[PDB]
């Protein structure tokens, strides 16, 4: 370390066994430290006992994400370009069924490459470029081929800002350890100056270049590469060059107008992607705020303020150490970032924001479950990293007697409640279904819980849905339809290939899933809540912050003394959430196809991918493999010899990989030792082993190779199960 510290060598450290705590990787050989090294590679209890750097690394090794997201996207714009189908698909939507990727016909490959639209062999897409891409106030294949290198530009450069940190002799403390302004900036002008800037390049150019696309043409029979300058003459069709107004204000006359916007709500008949005549106004109406907003402020003051009786004395002082944490100001974030992603996953499917979605079924549910697993994979995290706080981050105990020191005060308490909450749920929240089986398999419907047997009567309606689609008669101005076409009141006519959204009815078989979610969302959180709370000390172990937030398990005593910790609460809390999301998905498509998705023809006699089979028959939790899993999936297990086939052909692996997790999840440890030697023996006889003491998995590594597999198994299983029942009918 020790090596040359000094002052006295540019000469870099390539060669001399080890580094990472101090009777380190020792001279003496071993393997464990090769999963060490990668694991905990990023961490901070080592590197130095002194903040300083760390924030000087994380602001750099951050960077290389943007740059990456940036090398990525490029190979997607390039891809969504010269491996074309976008040109072809756009003159010809409702019709196509898009591609970007294609094999090369090496070995078996080609089956994977199967006629997708504007006349070519390839593998489809459920990742709605070709639909952000509607945008292109321009169109052209080589063009995206500029947007593309425009991408690699931001990268190399927005990747030499990461040389232009840590490796360059760095900023320091004040720079972040004065926080005083940060959000001031961020939200004001980027949050703002994007949404803002996005406005300017969202009616300028895009609106017009799909105002007269929503009809016909073949591009360049429209939208030149410059055309949209000073020429405010084509902006003539889509409202005035302000005619006699000057910089809004009022001494304005309308005997017949009101600038672009003229607010919509509903859905283009010919392109139901929601109206764009709005899409400017809403982004404009954003930015303003941010534009005004990012103009606080300088900190404590506002939190150093409102206290009460039982309230939070420490509210006041809610962390000096919120300029001195990270692990704290990351975990907070993840809960939001994360919880603020799966709020996407709704406003999307019950309010499409891109031209051609809904009709495009599979190219926005992929979405609504990809976005859905982040608004969850980022939340258990958002707990883990709080545990990482709760255990260690600060130097000593300087933080004292406050909102927390409070919450903890009760702790065998906040989690005392929550518990019973769950068993109240569960009993009202799952055995509920099991009634049905036991009594519908007993069979007496009189007494089930059907949308019709237990008292509810051919209506759901009177709640709040029915006071949403109907609200354009309040303080409400209006604009034909609602806000989200899926609401109770009025309207039908949505689309001329297939369908899109319509009411979406409820009652029971909507009533009780909606409740299983409760109990599922709740017991998830119990285990993370109590997990992060009891982070450091307890009446099973108090001497219990003494290593780190991991540690395998304290020891055979006290009865059990194993799981405890909170790596592990963030190990069995993943375990749930994989359900939390994995059953919410299961919900949406079985609805969204049992009803909604389906299809018009004469007299628009609606014909769902399934005549609402849901009805009386998800209520039975077998119906959930009678009507689901065994019904759909018949497309997965038919999928051989085709074009997609890579799904069925995954769906066996990964429906294997999962069923390999249990081995990592379910087993001892001096076991594979006791085994690894028999091995090590046979090894020595030929003279072939010892060097680098081969060793079994690091108790908790073992759990690391559970879980992670159990998910990348149990998950892509459906990622396959899905793309295979929306491609092809649906």
């Amino acid at each position: 370390l020790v090596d040359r510290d000094p002052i006295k060598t540019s000469f870099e450290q390539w060669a001399k066994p080890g580094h990472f705590s101090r009777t380190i990787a020792k001279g003496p050989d071993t393997t464990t430290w090769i999963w060490n090294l990668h694991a905990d590679a990023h961490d901070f209890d080592s590197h130095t006992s002194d903040l300083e750097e760390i924030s000087r690394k994380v602001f750099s090794a951050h960077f290389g994400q943007l740059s990456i997201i940036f090398l990525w996207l490029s190979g997607m714009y390039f891809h969504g370009a010269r491996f074309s189908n976008y040109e072809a698909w756009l003159n010809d939507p409702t019709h196509i069924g898009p591609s970007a990727q294609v094999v090369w016909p090496i070995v078996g490959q080609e089956i994977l490459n199967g006629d997708v639209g504007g006349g070519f062999r390839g593998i489809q897409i459920t990742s709605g470029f070709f639909q952000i891409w509607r945008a292109s106030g321009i169109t052209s294949e080589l063009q995206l081929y500029c947007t593309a290198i425009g991408a690699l530009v931001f990268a190399g450069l927005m990747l030499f800002a990461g040389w232009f940190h840590y490796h360059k002799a760095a900023p320091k403390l004040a720079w972040f350890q004065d926080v005083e302004s940060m959000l001031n900036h961020h939200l004001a002008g980027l949050l703002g100056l994007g949404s803002l800037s996005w406005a300017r390049h969202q009616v300028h150019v895009s609106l017009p270049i799909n105002q007269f696309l929503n009809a016909g043409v073949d591009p360049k029979e429209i939208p030149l590469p410059h055309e949209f300058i000073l020429n405010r003459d084509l902006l003539a069709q889509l409202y005035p060059s302000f005619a006699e107004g000057a910089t809004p204000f009022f001494t304005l006359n309308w005997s017949k107008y009101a600038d672009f916007l003229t607010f919509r709500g509903g859905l283009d008949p010919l392109t139901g992607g929601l109206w764009l005549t709005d899409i400017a106004h809403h982004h404009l109406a954003i930015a303003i705020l941010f534009l005004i907003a990012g103009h606080m402020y300088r900190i404590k003051d506002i939190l150093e303020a409102h206290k009460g009786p039982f309230t939070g004395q420490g509210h006041k002082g809610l962390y000096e150490i919120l300029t001195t944490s990270w692990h704290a100001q990351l975990s907070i974030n993840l809960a939001m970032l994360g919880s603020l992603t799966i709020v996407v996953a709704q406003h999307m499917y019950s309010m499409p924001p891109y031209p051609y979605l809904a009709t495009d079924y599979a190219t926005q549910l992929s979405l609504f479950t990809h976005h859905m697993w982040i608004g969850g994979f980022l939340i258990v995290g958002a707990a883990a990293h709080a545990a990482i706080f709760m255990v260690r981050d600060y130097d000593p105990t300087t933080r004292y007697n406050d909102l927390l020191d409070r919450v903890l005060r009760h702790r065998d308490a906040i989690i005392s409640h929550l518990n019973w909450v769950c068993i109240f749920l569960g009993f009202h929240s799952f055995g509920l279904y099991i009634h049905n089986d036991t009594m519908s398999a007993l069979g007496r419907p009189q007494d089930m819980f059907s949308d019709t047997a237990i008292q509810l009567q051919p209506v759901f309606a009177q709640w709040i849905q029915n006071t949403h689609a109907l609200a354009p008669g309040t303080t409400a101005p209006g604009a034909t339809a609602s806000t989200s076409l899926t609401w109770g009141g009025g309207d039908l006519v949505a689309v001329g290939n297939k369908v899109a959204l319509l009411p979406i009815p409820l009652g029971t078989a909507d009533f009780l899933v909606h409740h299983i979610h409760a109990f599922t969302i709740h017991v998830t959180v119990l285990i993370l809540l109590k997990g992060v709370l009891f982070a450091r000390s307890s009446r099973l172990i108090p001497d219990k912050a003494n290593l780190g937030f991991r540690f395998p398990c304290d020891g055979p005593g006290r009865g059990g003394t194993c799981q405890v910790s909170a790596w592990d609460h963030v190990f069995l809390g993943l375990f749930w959430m994989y359900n939390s999301i994995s059953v919410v998905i299961f919900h949406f498509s079985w609805k969204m196809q049992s009803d909604v998705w389906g299809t018009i023809n004469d007299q628009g006699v609606v014909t769902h991918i399934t005549a609402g089979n849901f009805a009386q028959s998800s209520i039975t939790i077998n119906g959930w493999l009678r009507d689901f899993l065994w019904a759909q999936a018949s497309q997965v297990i038919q999928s051989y010899g085709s074009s997609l086939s890579a799904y069925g052909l995954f769906f066996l692996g990964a429906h294997f990989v999962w069923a390999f997790s249990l081995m990592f999840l379910f087993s001892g440890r001096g076991y594979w030792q006791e085994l690894i030697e028999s091995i090590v023996w046979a090894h020595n006889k030929l003279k072939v082993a010892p060097a680098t003491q081969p060793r079994a998995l690091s108790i908790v590594q073992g759990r690391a190779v559970g879980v992670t597999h159990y998910l990348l198994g149990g998950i892509a299983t459906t990622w396959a199960f899905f793309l295979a029942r929306i491609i092809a009918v649906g």
Binding site: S10, F11, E12, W14, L142
Partner: protein, 176 residues
Amino acid sequence: SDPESLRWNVQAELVHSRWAMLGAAGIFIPEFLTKLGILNTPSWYTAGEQEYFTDTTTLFIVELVFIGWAEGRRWADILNPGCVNTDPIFPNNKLTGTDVGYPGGLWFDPLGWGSASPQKLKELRTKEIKNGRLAMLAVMGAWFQHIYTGTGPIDNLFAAHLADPHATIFAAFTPK
């Protein structure tokens, strides 16, 4: 703050160099030489226009039986005797090292003054134009590029195309 960054053979890279480059000599002067309009013409009838082809891949064999032979003999007794094991003198060997070759065996050696010194003076000559030849040929090997790319009409491959003025290739000069 400056790379770390290398070598050591930093000593050997420099002798496929005098290999690569001197060598490009062979192409540089014979080409242009060629001999414009010699009088003229290039015609080779002789072993070549009637005995069923002459070479191509008996070409190589004979062709680099020799290069064969000689390129090997080239670096692998450039010099290095001692020629085995077992502790470090670095290059990745000099496991010849402290012994050149032989303790009083034969005339391993060239030349008096117990070494191999091809005398002291001659930095001249080959420091200059020669590790020139390295440099030179960088840019009239960057001519190889200019000299022909553009696959004289007789083929557009993967049709961008991508605009059009007029042709290109070689013979000397330039429109400009």
